[PDB]
Design a protein around this ligand. Sequence first.
Ligand SMILES: [Zn+2]
Ligand SMILES: [Zn+2]
Lengths: 44, 152, 151, 66, 148, 50, 82, 67, 115, 62, 260
Amino acid sequence: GEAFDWLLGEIESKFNQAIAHPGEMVGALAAQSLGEPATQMTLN
Amino acid sequence: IQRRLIKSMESVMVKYDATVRNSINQVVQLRYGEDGLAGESVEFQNLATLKPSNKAFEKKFRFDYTNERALRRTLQEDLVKDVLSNAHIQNELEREFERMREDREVLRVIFPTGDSKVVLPCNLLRMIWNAQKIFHINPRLPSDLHPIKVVE
Amino acid sequence: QSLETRAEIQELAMVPRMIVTPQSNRPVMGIVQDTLTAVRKFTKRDVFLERGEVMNLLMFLSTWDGKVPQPAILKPRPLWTGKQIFSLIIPGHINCIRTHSTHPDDEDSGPYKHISPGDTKVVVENGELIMGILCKKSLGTSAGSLVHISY
Amino acid sequence: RHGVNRQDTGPLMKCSFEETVDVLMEAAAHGESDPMKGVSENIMLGQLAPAGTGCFDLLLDAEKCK
Amino acid sequence: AGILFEDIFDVKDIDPEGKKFDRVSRLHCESESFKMDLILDVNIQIYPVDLGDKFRLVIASTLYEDGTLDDGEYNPTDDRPSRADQFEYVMYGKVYRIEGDETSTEAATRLSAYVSYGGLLMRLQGDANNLHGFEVDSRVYLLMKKLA
Amino acid sequence: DNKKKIIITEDGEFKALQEWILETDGVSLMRVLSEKDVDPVRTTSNDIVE
Amino acid sequence: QANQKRITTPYMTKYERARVLGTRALQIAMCAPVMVELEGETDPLLIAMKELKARKIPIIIRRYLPDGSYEDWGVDELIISD
Amino acid sequence: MIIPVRCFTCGKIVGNKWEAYLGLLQAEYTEGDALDALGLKRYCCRRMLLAHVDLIEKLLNYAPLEK
Amino acid sequence: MNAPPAFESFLLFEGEKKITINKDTKVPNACLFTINKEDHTLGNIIKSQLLKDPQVLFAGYKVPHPLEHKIIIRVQTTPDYSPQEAFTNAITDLISELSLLEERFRVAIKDKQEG
Amino acid sequence: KHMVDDKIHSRARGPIQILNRQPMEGRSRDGGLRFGEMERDCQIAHGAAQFLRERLFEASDP
Amino acid sequence: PYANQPTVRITELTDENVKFIIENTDLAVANSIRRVFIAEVPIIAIDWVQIDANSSVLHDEFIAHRLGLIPLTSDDIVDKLQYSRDCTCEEFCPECSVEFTLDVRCNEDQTRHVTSRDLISNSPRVIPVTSRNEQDDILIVKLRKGQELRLRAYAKKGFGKEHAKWNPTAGVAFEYDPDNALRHTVYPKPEEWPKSEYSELDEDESQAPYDPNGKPERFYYNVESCGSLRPETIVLSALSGLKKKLSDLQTQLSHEIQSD
RNA sequence: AUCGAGAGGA
Ligand SMILES: [Zn+2]
Ligand SMILES: [Zn+2]
């Protein structure tokens, strides 16, 4: 029971930590995330 | 290509109502990534109810409250007595399995190919392992966790 | 050039805050050339450190509680293992399973799954390297590695 | 430019990308108004971009300074 | 006493899979008093072991002859009577797994305790009667001595 | 398996059926879809404009 | 907007933490009163972080919504994670 | 341009051996035997004498600035 | 442009202490000796001599940065002993060893030149 | 030929260009380093708006 | 808990090198002695040059650097001279420095070899090694007719930590456990490796049987001298310097302990 | 100092 209660609290806290923050420039971040790998993949 | 992508998406941002919008205030996504989660905290996991067969799914996820001796091996005496005697608890567990079976069909239509690799926020198996080691769980002894407590 | 910009950089752009990238939800920096070849050689099963060598290495742990661990071999001569010192390096009580790059694919099926003849199958428990040879797969920039799980 | 500078993003954001002169000249001919909503427009005017640390305001709490 | 297990083993094979490490060797041994299999990793550089050897193995929870817990910290300046004095090869490790042949309804007739001595791995498997002293995440000592 | 036909057997397991597929060098998705014995559900194209 | 029902997150964002800490550190550097006790701290950033941990920063975050309204949150009302 | 004074590696003096080395070479010694005669036993000092290019002899083909 | 003078590895700056002793609070009976303008030459011998003391539980040293010119020697002893006393005895023992080695090398040279 | 002493450079409020009152270009001109478009995009992704304003307004040409 | 009782055995003593063996000492002591041979045995070397005239094809810093690396006999004088840090004089004095003068002019048609023999000293005890009363003289510069080199140097006391020109050694061979008995090396193919000159093994045997209870003892040394000091003077001065380093450390230690 | 060109570095 103690382990399960701790597990529930841990899941809740980590999930609330995974939520996106208002103000994240996800568009610039996505452009960088898609352009950085483009520099390694082959031209031919 | 990099410059073009940047200039195309530069002002798209997560707003305080949690929608993703551009400079015009038009809505690009009602929630970021369709789930409103940041990409740093998510990680690879496995859906355990996607690939198994119906028999295996039944055998692994249907709580068997009829086998008295198996429950005696898994649970403590008061928990075994409450699970075997009470019918409210048994109906709760039965509906738990039905809900998991519905979830199974939802996953089967979401992932039409049998790929259980998913990217989700919390690594539940690692958290369970952490709880096992933090509280010194003995895997060989019967547990004092009521399955109704798990459901609730 | 201002306290506001300094606080901004300190709370947003500092390197430790930058360990995991949102691009691919994995570490962006990992252990690299000499440290990676050496940690591979160090966590092999037959790495035995003497008392003076162990104290020399413990001088370079910033996060050391000052307690020398009980050596893995007490007799005929006290010897610590490389895994026993990396266990001191590993932080917290993290738990991690990986596999060394030379892990044979038909070992997880047969016997010896939990006692690996080749010292593959990395297992860290409660922040101790219980077994396995650390490598790119365990300390690199991939997902689910020790550095990722630590972060 | 044929997809990004054809949306209603404002002339200053568009001139930052491509066709600086054509975009600004079109905006002049049509009297377009840039509302300064994007990050490019604020960056050009040296103003705090509504991005990250700029997406909100701070106010002093008079009742708590006591 | 603080002894979880004691028996005499006979080296029946050394490195069946071939030599994996230079200074470390895996022994596959079997006892006679309890019929327990043993896989053990030993530093053969300092404590060489030949095929067909016969040794006494003692898994203990402590080295002090009187029942007294250990702190897991290295104390070379300790003058108490330690049972390591009566043995040649001594290692210190922790139990990281206990398998068995248990079913959903039946208990285990045979157990399999796994111990790691700083990476040198041991598996002691046999009757569950002889492996009640083993509990996962518990520190033990090897206490192994060669006999003629 | 990304191009095989992944079905769900009556026992509930995922099974990858090994079936014939055609790859064309041009695109008439409009016409090819409306052909007898052609799957109008999985037949696709890489020309996003079409 | 009804202050009784604020729809934004009850957590302080990383950007809110960054800007609040920077702002309060500048205020301390400009001889503003400190709300917490001080052992020997002389760096405004350390004092601002101590005030944030103590939940004693006298700043209100005005979070704007896309529709144009706003929500005022005291720094003590938000959940500080890092 | 001129023979170094010390061996870069060990610090053995090689400055006084260039002229003797050349004199041994015109005496029909092999370079190895010449280096052995001068006592250069470590391959670092043998490197110093064996790889030296006396450029100063070419710089002395130009008349100085003052007579 | 940025080259430190070569004497800065050996010479103490004004107001800079040759050795500083700081109590280690993590474990009892441990000290950190920060020795300025020394390097592995003294650190290694002091450490290895301290390891010969059975009352020394820990003896280690490090050069925290090669471009910097200090060493730190951590010494932990048994409770009845002291790390300062251990460090002193280690230096005394090294001095006596070097004196004996010097006298014996003088004798060996005299024998070699004579016969 | 590439020695570090011929490459090391620093600036703190040096000379500025005539046309746009921004730092000069080059070590030889005691110029400032270019905070380019890609740096602007990186700091936008970081969300560092005050640092971005410092680099593109206050440290260049207020 | 106490000192070693090292013994010594000198196996060769020439004017050029000393080959000896130290037994019953720790590896750290042996390596600190080896390091002090290179880096903390003071000698005299030119560390100040004033070029009054240089028409040679090598620029001034070339000549100065080249003069600094000429070894100067330092045997009995180095202990007497002071460091200019410690001297209470002006820039220079005879108590902390030695004056050299060089004045050469090529008037004749053949190339004039300005060598270390042209470094004239005020102190007869501190002279260039090659100029000491065979090995030729170190070559400072070759001069053509009409070229001229006139300079004034001052030599100072220093050791190899400050500059390699104050290093008295021309190589310090150091070895221990010639047969790999401690297995501090691990040869993948021990048969492929040549035997040490100090090895005692029959040719069929590649390395000694592993010694589990072994420690590094019996360190072999070959200290070759650049010329400034005699090799045995290098070893004796190394031991004295290491002992004074430890004595100064103990003095400062006592002040720190008593001040607490 | 400006402009251009060229040569390079990553
Ligand atoms: Zn050499
Ligand atoms: Zn003087």
